[PDB]
Design a binder for these strands. Sequence first.
RNA 1: UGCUGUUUU
Length: 184
Amino acid sequence: DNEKMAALEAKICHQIEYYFGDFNLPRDKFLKEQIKLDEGWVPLEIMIKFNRLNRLTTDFNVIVEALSKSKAELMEISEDKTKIRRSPSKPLPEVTDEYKNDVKNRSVYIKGFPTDATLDDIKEWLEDKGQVLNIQMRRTLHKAFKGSIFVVFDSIESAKKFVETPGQKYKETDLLILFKDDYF
RNA sequence: UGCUGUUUU
């Protein structure tokens, strides 16, 4: 059962690091508010209101233990273990031309998922395909999923590898895979 | 990053 706990804690790490990451934090009004009141410190009481974390755990001890063993070294834990924050060692990148051009060059468009596909289905599908930093499910005005996504890879190398892999499928369907540069 | 809408159409 120590095995299941370790796997649970990896997920908790990944989820919280996403929330405070480069691809969510700057567009996350609710998280931004909480981050201004203390020196970046946000209480665990408030973090467990985030739905994906909430399904993983509501136990403070499990979250604190997860982030202590994390290899990303993004999150710090307060002295009293009640609050977490993004390390002042990891500032948010200034959104420059260089930065956005660098993100664009490793961002990929994929179309051909079923419209009833969930984020968890897509994540499962992307597991062996390279380090992915963001998944954006493209939606209509009324919030129906189109069956296309934008994915941001860690490096152009890992994006290129993926884009150049021949006949990629989601179960049944052939996928259209394009650099976001090539999509309009 | 992105996406979205924006009548001094």
